[PDB]
Structure 1
Amino acid sequence: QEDVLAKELEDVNKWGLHVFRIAELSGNRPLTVIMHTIFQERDLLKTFKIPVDTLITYLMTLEDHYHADVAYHNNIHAADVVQSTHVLLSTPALEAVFTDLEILAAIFASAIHDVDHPGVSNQFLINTNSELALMYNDSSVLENHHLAVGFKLLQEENCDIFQNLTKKQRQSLRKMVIDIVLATDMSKHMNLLADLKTMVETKKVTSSGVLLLDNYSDRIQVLQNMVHCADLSNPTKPLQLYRQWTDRIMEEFFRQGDRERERGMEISPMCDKHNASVEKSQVGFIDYIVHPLWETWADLVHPDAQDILDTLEDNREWYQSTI
């Protein structure tokens, strides 16, 4: 029903949106309806003269190119990252900091950032001599692919949502989107976090108390880390959402491990369904990856993200308590 879905989408500005309920109520179109809602909320159709029928046509085609048969890296994950990026962009420490084009780039990058993901890792694709790894010379294999598909779909019939941007706007947005999606490669995490830490330690704020970002390198680095935080935000969400994300990533990992075991390869970490500890893996994920990242983001925008960090820390203690 449309009324109940409209009611749920009133939460689009809130951390912890019931994204699985929105997927059900929208008829498995969470990415389309959440993107459309966000574009209306931020007045992006009027600002960039995006025809509404073109937006819907592109969104439905993009959503179609996520795999409905992968447990984690599907259109619900994309919708979740889009919405989480949308909330992070609204944080008071960043008010009036980014232009309308940078906002468009960050939201578009989130929407396409995992498109056509096959449900296995870059290393699996490299180690199996996949056609994707051969195409991309073993370097950010999935992320180059997500970008290429995301942009190529703009060329389908009535899909060019950027048709009314100027040529310079299109060139700038394309560069920013590429910079952002390539930064979601998990092998870049340590370098991205090291740079975010440096920016926190050298942070400057303006007279209005918002973050001072006066060059492309700093601006794109904040947008890269923002989308990376959104991508790694599952343990910061209310527990009933977090546990569903955990169930889904473990299913994807175990299916990868079954293909590795069947092929005689070493099983990747956390992918052996016969020797895995789901709870210990979440605590380690939080301790070594997610909390170091979110604690640093929370410092950059202090005190805006304190409640998100509080939820992360509660969820860590809950998983720890199940061991």
Structure 2
Amino acid sequence: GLMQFTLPVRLCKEIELFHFDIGPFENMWPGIFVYMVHRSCGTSCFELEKLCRFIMSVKKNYRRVPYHNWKHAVTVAHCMYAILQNNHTLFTDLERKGLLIACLCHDLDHRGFSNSYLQKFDHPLAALYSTSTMEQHHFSQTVSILQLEGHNIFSTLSSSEYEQVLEIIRKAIIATDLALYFGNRKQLEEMYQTGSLNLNNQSHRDRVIGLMMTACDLCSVTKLWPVTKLTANDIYAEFWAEGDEMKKLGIQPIPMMDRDKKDEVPQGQLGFYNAVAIPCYTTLTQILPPTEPLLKACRDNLSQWEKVIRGEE
């Protein structure tokens, strides 16, 4: 237990910043995650052997899809790491433990298709989980991996601490259904403005963690422009494949998923920043001031999409 994970100097310094990109070396991603657990939680939070075995089963249960893959999982965990490290004293020991795991697991066994496409295809998961279909599946895959021999990283917790941490993870993962984000953020906006927001109220904390999960999930829009732009290419590679699968079912896909409407992407990105990303990081910054760099980076990326529309890119 005297085994610190360390990182080369550039990674050691840059991992602390919100805009860090975990890089193209897949074999370094498990080490990067353990490094983040050790610093945001402690070398004592998890047994190394169990944690390592859990990480590698999680990786194996992400598919080789263009965007909703193992790289996305670690990227979303790093954004959470950055939020937790900039808000040291606001989070409980169980929240520290639960949230990095929730982020690593939040898209487990994603197939590259929306809840909407599973409902239209009539996939078995759509009959098992009528709303937040993929997100209920991701939580289900998380419990399955935690129950494999030698994979229970929470085995040192009491029965009630264990139930609390799995409840934090379930809610965090469900919150990554962007259909739920709009109402969650509106409620948080009203509570912050009327001054009713109270972090001792468990159902208020739940809403704030939900928004943190949206913020981490969307964190592609908070990177250096070349990261943002190249990640958008992966996002559309998925959306357009789903669009193709919609046309195979005899359904005109929405424009966001129709590869024949590529020309509309820059304006689609503008809508997305204005309707989803900017309001997400605005409310997050109001509640947790030290997350302001996420909002500032998002606004810089919106200005870059504006440049793309004006033909200056």
- Relative to the length of structure 2, the TM-score reads 0.91
Q: Which residue in 2 is equivalent to 1:34?
A: 32
- CA apart distance, 1:220: 1.6
Asked if the contact 2:135–2:176 (Cα under 8 Å) also holds between the matched residues in 1, the reply is yes
Q: Which residue in 2 is equivalent to 1:127?
A: 120
- Gaps of at least 5 residues in structure 1 are 205-210
What percentage of aligned pairs have identical amino acids?
25
Asked if the contact 1:26–1:33 (Cα under 8 Å) also holds between the matched residues in 2, the reply is no
1:110 aligns with 2:103: yes
The structure with the largest helix share of the pair is 2
Q: Map Cα deviations across residues 261-290 of structure 1 (whole Å, 9 max, x no partner).
A: 122112133111112322111111101111
Alignment of 1:15-26 (within 5 A): 15-19=18-22, 21=23, 24-26=24-26
1:292 aligns with 2:284: no
Query: Which residue of 268, 284, 300 corresponds with 2:254?
Result: 268
SS in 1 for 2:259: coil
Query: Which amino acid letter does the alignment assign opposite residue 182 of structure 1?
Result: I
- CA apart distance, 1:4: 11
Query: Which amino acid letter does the alignment assign opposite residue 279 of structure 2?
Result: P
1:231 aligns with 2:217: yes
Q: Which residue in 2 is equivalent to 1:154?
A: 146
- CA apart distance, 1:51: 1.5
SS in 2 for 1:280: helix
Asked if the contact 1:8–1:18 (Cα under 8 Å) also holds between the matched residues in 2, the reply is no
Asked if the contact 1:116–1:149 (Cα under 8 Å) also holds between the matched residues in 2, the reply is yes
1:53 aligns with 2:53: no
Q: Map Cα deviations across residues 119-167 of structure 1 (whole Å, 9 max, x no partner).
A: 000000001100111121x211000000000111012231111111111
Query: Which residue of 5, 8, 22 corresponds with 1:6?
Result: 8
Q: Distance in 2 between matches of 1:44 and 1:77?
A: 24
Q: Distance in 2 between matches of 1:187 and 1:43?
A: 31
**Cα distance change, pair 5–260 in 1 and its aligned pair in 2 (3 A):** farther
Q: Map Cα deviations across residues 7-36 of structure 1 (whole Å, 9 max, x no partner).
A: 4541322112122x2xx3343x62x22321
SS in 2 for 1:217: helix
Q: Distance in 2 between matches of 1:260 and 1:109?
A: 30
Query: Which residue of 154, 157, 173 corresponds with 2:165?
Result: 173
Q: Distance in 1 between matches of 2:90 and 2:261?
A: 47
CA root-mean-square deviation: 1.9
Query: Which amino acid letter does the alignment assign opposite residue 273 of structure 2?
Result: I
Q: Distance in 2 between matches of 1:89 and 1:18?
A: 17
Q: Distance in 2 between matches of 1:103 and 1:114?
A: 19
SS in 2 for 1:275: helix
SS in 1 for 2:261: coil
**Cα distance change, pair 236–251 in 1 and its aligned pair in 2 (3 A):** same
Query: Which residue of 81, 84, 97 corresponds with 2:79?
Result: 84
Alignment of 1:141-290 (within 5 A): 141-203=133-195, 213-276=199-262, 277-290=264-277
Task: Give aligned pairs, total.
Answer: 303
Query: Which amino acid letter does the alignment assign opposite residue 55 of structure 1?
Result: L
Q: Distance in 2 between matches of 1:170 and 1:56?
A: 19
- Gaps of at least 5 residues in structure 2 are none
Q: Distance in 1 between matches of 2:11 and 2:308?
A: 33
